[PDB]
């Protein structure tokens, strides 16, 4: 039992001591920082561990080098973009002038400011980002600024002026998604005491966190079965009885979309078809409630236009999958005929 618990604990989302398969990016960041201690923009997909690797390398530099002050800040913690200005000042001690005068000092330790999730610092005129990027290139500047983002167009959409002036272009580094071999290496690094899951994770999103969750859930199911390839595929397929009136309603809507060919059907015509089908088989608030319940299950989508009749209905499932979801052909034939 302790083996399963330890395997679950090791495979958590907490930042580990070592992050393999990312040695190239870590080396690039280390060389950049060591050159600028004796403007960086990291862009990457979610789950690439950019925050974890940057924290690890910053801790390593703190351990090995002295004479610099490192300031972390998360943009999500700020309700307003402008609120970045005080939060920085509170970490070092009109306010922007005080920041500049404290940053342009002739004598002073280097400052390494990192703002996680840079994309949240957007402004109606992008002024804050412009000032932040123009700070390192002022007179007597001692700033090494690092910006982490998931968006790939921050250097494109937000900063045309920095492309206009050659001196103010930062150095960009992108984090490619983890490949299957890299995921396998990380997984075997976690368990020093698989390929199929790594392949699916790489093909879908390449998110190491998703693979960790998949293997954690597989371990959970295995330990539950014991206490009482198959597990991994089972969990992934799991993530990646209907009321009779709802069956009649969805069959009527399918008949309507097959008949009149329109993509979206008004609720009144749907109710009329439902009543006709019920009369055929001898079986408006109830109809709308059933439509809402079907929307809850994710079978049907509703464009809500603030009125009962104006709310439009559409499907989300292929016809063949709809037919095969039904376990009885007698009802199918009866409704068709």
């Amino acid at each position: 039992g302790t083996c399963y618990q330890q395997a679950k604990l090791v495979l958590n989302t907490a930042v580990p001591d070592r992050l393999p398969a990312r040695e190239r990016e870590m080396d690039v960041i280390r060389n950049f920082l060591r050159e600028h201690i004796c403007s960086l923009y990291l862009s990457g997909a979610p789950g690439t561990g950019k925050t974890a690797c940057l924290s690890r390398i910053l801790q390593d530099l703190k351990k090995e080098l002295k004479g610099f002050k490192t300031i972390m800040l998360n943009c999500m913690s700020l309700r307003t973009a402008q609120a970045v200005f005080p939060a920085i000042a509170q970490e070092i001690c009109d306010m922007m002038r005080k920041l500049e005068k404290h940053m342009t000092a002739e004598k002073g330790p280097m400052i390494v400011l990192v703002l996680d999730e840079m994309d949240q610092l957007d402004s109606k005129g992008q002024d804050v980002l412009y000032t932040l990027f123009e700070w390192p290139w002022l007179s007597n500047s001692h700033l090494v600024l690092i910006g982490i983002a998931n968006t790939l167009d921050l250097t494109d959409r937000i900063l045309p002026r920095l492309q206009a002036r050659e001196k103010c272009k930062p150095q960009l580094l992108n984090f490619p998604p983890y490949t299957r071999n890299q995921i396998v290496t990380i997984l075997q690094d976690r368990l020093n005491q698989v390929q199929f899951c790594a392949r699916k994770v790489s093909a879908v999103s390449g998110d190491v966190r998703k693979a960790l969750d998949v293997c954690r859930r597989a371990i959970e199911i295995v330990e539950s079965d014991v206490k009482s390839l198959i597990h991994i595929s089972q969990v992934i397929s799991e993530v990646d009885s209907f009321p009779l009136q709802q069956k009649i309603l969805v069959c009527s809507l399918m008949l309507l979309i097959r008949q009149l060919k329109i993509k979206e059907v008004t609720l009144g015509k749907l109710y009329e078809a439902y009543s006709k089908v019920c009369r055929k088989q001898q079986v408006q608030s109830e109809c709308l409630s059933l439509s809402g319940l079907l929307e809850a299950r994710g079978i049907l989508g509703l464009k809500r236009n603030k009125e009962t009749r104006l709310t439009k209905v559409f499907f989300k499932i292929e016809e063949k999958e709809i037919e095969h979801a039904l376990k009885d052909k007698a009802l199918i034939g009866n409704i068709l005929a």
Binding site: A14, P46, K210, D213, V214, R217, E272, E286, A296
Partner: protein
Amino acid sequence: SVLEEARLRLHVSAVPESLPCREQEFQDIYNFVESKLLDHTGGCMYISGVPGTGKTATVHEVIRCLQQAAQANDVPPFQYIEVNGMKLTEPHQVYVQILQKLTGQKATANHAAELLAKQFCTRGSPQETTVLLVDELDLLWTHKQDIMYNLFDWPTHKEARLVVLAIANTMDLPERIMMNRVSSRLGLTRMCFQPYTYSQLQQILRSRLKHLKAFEDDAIQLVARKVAALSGDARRCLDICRRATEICEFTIAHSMEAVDEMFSSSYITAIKNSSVLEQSFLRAILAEFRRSGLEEATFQQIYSQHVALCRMEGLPYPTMSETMAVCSHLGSCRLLLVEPSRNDLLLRVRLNVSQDDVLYALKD
């Protein structure tokens, strides 16, 4: 009396101690937090289900079991906080509601959020594991999605010691409402509660009325079958049983009366009990619609058809004001659709009910 006892047992607020109808789900939940309580590590789970599936009751029963286990010094002590989304005047105010629950301090929304962030991000004094329950998640939405992001991201931190369970009705919420990083955080941890089968409903009803012989098996079976064929909800089943008891105070006929009185629409009888002039107006509208085929008609053509029908029927010539008053009275009870506040002779009229229902009401 036996009927009084049955009424008392069938009340909604009379929660049972434990019904194994959801035990499986219970067991699953009974593992998850338990592990999160034994490893001193936080977690997050999203549970989506249609209303009336007993999600709140199941969560409360699990919390009761965990509290009882903690009182028996088998689980390390923990602090439980429960918040309801729809019981809050403003979204951001939840930051206060949590804070005052854990420290009792009064602060503004921004300051409360800052203090909560500081407490959950900084290595403070070792506190008991925090079990946070949030109800009606979809009502905490914001165009900036900051509150939801923080709620589902804070337990990720090791120092948080936070376990969060998000109860909601829509299973699509983490995909089409939740952004990418937070979607994967709740991903692979979605519990879906299916509606009760008629067997489950019958078991629940039998458990409600154990050792009590007041209802026949046929009536209970028919009530459960009807509920399964309509919505599969326990609340309306209990309401139908209560109404059937009330009628029996005055067989399957009682349950049939309850179900067809508390579910059926009253449009037909309201039309039937309408006045003669209103009936003539409706007939004129139907005739004009048949002549034209459109679902919108101006008030002038309707008035002309009404005048023709009155002449055919021999009724006295009606004035425009009387017709407009009748139209306003009909529109007040939402039988039609009109905006007669400013326009008088150029009013678009739409039927609020199906034409065949009108025909079946007017044929008699």
